[PDB]
Amino acid sequence: HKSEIAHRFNDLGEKHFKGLVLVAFSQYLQQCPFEDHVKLVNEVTEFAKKCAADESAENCDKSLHTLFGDKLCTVATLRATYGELADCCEKQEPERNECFLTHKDDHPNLPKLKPEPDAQCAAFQEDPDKFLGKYLYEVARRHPYFYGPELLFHAEEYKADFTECCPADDKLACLIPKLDALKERILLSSAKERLKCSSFQNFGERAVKAWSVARLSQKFPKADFAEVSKIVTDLTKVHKECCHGDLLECADDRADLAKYICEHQDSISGKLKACCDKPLLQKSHCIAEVKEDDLPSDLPALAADFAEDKEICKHYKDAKDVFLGTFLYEYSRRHPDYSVSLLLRIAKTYEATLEKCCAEADPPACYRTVFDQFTPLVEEPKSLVKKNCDLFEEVGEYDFQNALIVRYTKKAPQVSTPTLVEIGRTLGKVGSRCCKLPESERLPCSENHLALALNRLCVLHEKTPVSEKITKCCTDSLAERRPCFSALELDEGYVPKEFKAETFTFHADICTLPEDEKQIKKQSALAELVKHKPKATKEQLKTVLGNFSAFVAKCCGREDKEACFAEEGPKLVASSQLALA
Numbered sequence: 001h002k003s004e005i006a007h008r009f010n011d012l013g014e015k016h017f018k019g020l021v022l023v024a025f026s027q028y029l030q031q032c033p034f035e036d037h038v039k040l041v042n043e044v045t046e047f048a049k050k051c052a053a054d055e056s057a058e059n060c061d062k063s064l065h066t067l068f069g070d071k072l073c074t075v076a077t078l079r080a081t082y083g084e085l086a087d088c089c090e091k092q093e094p095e096r097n098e099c100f101l102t103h104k105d106d107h108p109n110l111p112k113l114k115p116e117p118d119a120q121c122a123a124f125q126e127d128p129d130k131f132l133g134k135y136l137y138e139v140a141r142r143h144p145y146f147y148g149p150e151l152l153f154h155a156e157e158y159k160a161d162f163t164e165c166c167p168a169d170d171k172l173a174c175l176i177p178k179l180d181a182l183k184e185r186i187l188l189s190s191a192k193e194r195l196k197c198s199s200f201q202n203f204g205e206r207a208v209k210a211w212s213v214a215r216l217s218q219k220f221p222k223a224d225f226a227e228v229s230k231i232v233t234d235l236t237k238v239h240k241e242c243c244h245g246d247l248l249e250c251a252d253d254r255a256d257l258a259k260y261i262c263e264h265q266d267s268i269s270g271k272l273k274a275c276c277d278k279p280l281l282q283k284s285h286c287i288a289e290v291k292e293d294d295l296p297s298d299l300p301a302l303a304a305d306f307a308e309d310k311e312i313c314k315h316y317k318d319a320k321d322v323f324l325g326t327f328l329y330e331y332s333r334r335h336p337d338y339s340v341s342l343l344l345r346i347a348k349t350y351e352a353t354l355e356k357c358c359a360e361a362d363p364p365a366c367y368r369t370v371f372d373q374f375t376p377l378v379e380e381p382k383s384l385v386k387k388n389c390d391l392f393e394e395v396g397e398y399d400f401q402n403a404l405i406v407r408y409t410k411k412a413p414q415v416s417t418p419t420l421v422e423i424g425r426t427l428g429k430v431g432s433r434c435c436k437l438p439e440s441e442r443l444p445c446s447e448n449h450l451a452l453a454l455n456r457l458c459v460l461h462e463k464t465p466v467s468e469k470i471t472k473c474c475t476d477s478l479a480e481r482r483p484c485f486s487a488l489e490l491d492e493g494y495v496p497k498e499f500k501a502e503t504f505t506f507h508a509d510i511c512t513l514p515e516d517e518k519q520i521k522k523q524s525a526l527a528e529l530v531k532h533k534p535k536a537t538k539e540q541l542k543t544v545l546g547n548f549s550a551f552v553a554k555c556c557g558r559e560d561k562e563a564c565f566a567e568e569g570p571k572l573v574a575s576s577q578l579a580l581a
């Protein structure tokens with residue numbers, strides 16, 4: 001890295017480089033229009049090229065963040081558009097970058113990416129590069145911690161979507177479901193990555209490593225610990241870089257990691273073969289999403305090393321991180337059936353148990369039961385997975401979301417309704433994602449995914465702290481975030497939001513809404529019902545919401561939708577309150 005920009009440019013190649021720089025900028029400057037960003041990345045890419053041509057050219061030896069940060073800081077109306085980021089631009093690197101990062105907007109609340117399949121295919125044909133670029137921009141700026149290389153990957157998917165659908169007859173129906181599925185994948189990936197970044201940010205790299213160790217151990221149970229460690233080290237670096245906005249380095253290192261992993265796929269997992277026969281983004285993505293390898297038949301019994309060995313305390317004092325790390329690896333690799341956070345909690349408990357036991361007189365007698373300390377850690381979420389998947393399976397996603405929305409509005413009524421609705425909806429999306437899964441997968445799926453949504457909440461909460469319960473759950477141990485949240489009950493301290501009839505007042509407008517947004521409106525109402533009536537049981541809320549849904553469906557099916565809403569809503573608005581006592 002004589003010229004780090006030349007280096008990244010050469011490594012990544014212009015398409016990916018430009019894409020990542022676009023992502024980077026879009027993420028750092030989420031409000032600057034697409035075209036601004038494009039000129040920004042073109043300038044940066046031109047400069048990258050100039051540097052690759054001659055790495056001794058002036059400023060070519062400046063760091064990527066110096067370079068890009070500078071480019072960002074040159075944007076038109078940086079102070080009017082980003083009064084916060086202005087000050088960042090006053091700052092040198094890495095302070096500047098740290099500032100930009102800090103001012104990343106996790107909830108830019110930009111317009112909903114909705115297909116305009118005619119206009120968009122049009123723009124995809126007019127310039128597919130400007131269109132996929134635009135996509136990178138849109139998604140990136142909506143998700144300023146979106147995993148850059150992954151975004152490029154998704155850009156590829158998105159392209160494929162417009163490649164397949166734009167020529168198609170019902171381009172809209174060929175495309176929208178793809179784009180919808182893609183948004184779900186985006187949202188999920190964004191959340192995954194945001195979690196990673198949040199984890200660095202809020203818990204540090206060790207937390208991320210522990211997480212990755214657990215995860216990768218599950219994913220690559222056959223890989224030995226050194227291997228998982230190496231990959232976790234690298235992957236953590238990749239995520240660290242991506243999260244710290246070092247997207248070129250992140251991508252480059254990710255590519256390297258993918259290469260490494262694929263070079264060692266037999267040392268790592270048989271599930272990689274499909275990933276490693278893919279091109280670089282697709283390969284990386286595939287490894288990132290790779291299904292867990294089969295448990296090896298030679299998984300070591302764990303009691304000997306981790307419970308029975310008489311010098312465990314010695315190992316544990318002598319090499320805490322390595323011993324624990326390997327414990328985590330072992331437990332995790334044998335526990336794809338556990339969420340990562342469960343494995344971490346288990347690791348934490350294993351650690352806590354050595355801490356306890358090893359400070360005790362006969363540590364071996366004490367930690368010999370260590371594996372048994374994990375049991376309640378396992379049962380708690382397994383029980384929730386069952387409780388909630390039962391519920392989900394019983395009531396379906398909407399009502400599950402309602403459930404969650406109620407629960408979370410209860411837990412954190414201070415949270416904006418849109419956020420509760422979002423979180424509860426995403427949380428219910430866990431029901432959909434995880435409850436249908438093979439039973440051994442629901443727990444990992446659901447807790448991992450809840451980690452994402454909770455992190456989302458946390459992330460949103462960072463920006464918009466409204467609840468201390470949220471803060472605590474979000475900032476106390478990450479492994480416990482989900483249990484912390486799950487454990488949250490009705491914030492008793494919450495003064496019920498004053499009643500605003502209007503809030504629960506629907507109008508014919510809701511009828512034009514696609515069912516998702518109709519639901520969201522209802523679910524917002526729902527959150528509001530909770531906020532106003534926090535102690536309303538979830539069942540009262542459900543009935544009231546059912547009443548609202550009923551009235552909404554009715555009045556929407558009405559000849560005069562609005563007369564209907566106007567006549568029936570108020571009574572409903574008033575009565576539903578009595579139903580929430």
Ligand SMILES: O=C(O)c1cc(I)cc(I)c1O
Binds near residue numbers: 113138139179182
């Ligand atoms: O328009 C887009 O760029 C777009 C992008 C995604 I990701 C999802 C949907 I639905 C979209 O319409």
Ligand SMILES: O=C(O)c1cc(I)cc(I)c1O
Binds near residue numbers: 257
């Ligand atoms: O998710 C990722 O960012 C990721 C990327 C690569 I390359 C390898 C693994 I394992 C991952 O988990």
Ligand SMILES: O=C(O)c1cc(I)cc(I)c1O
Binds near residue numbers: 384404434447
């Ligand atoms: O709502 C929960 O607290 C919850 C927790 C877990 I772990 C799994 C599922 I599915 C849930 O719904």
Ligand SMILES: O=C(O)c1cc(I)cc(I)c1O
Binds near residue numbers: 395541545
């Ligand atoms: O379907 C449910 O079980 C459900 C659960 C809760 I908690 C709140 C609402 I509204 C519901 O509709």
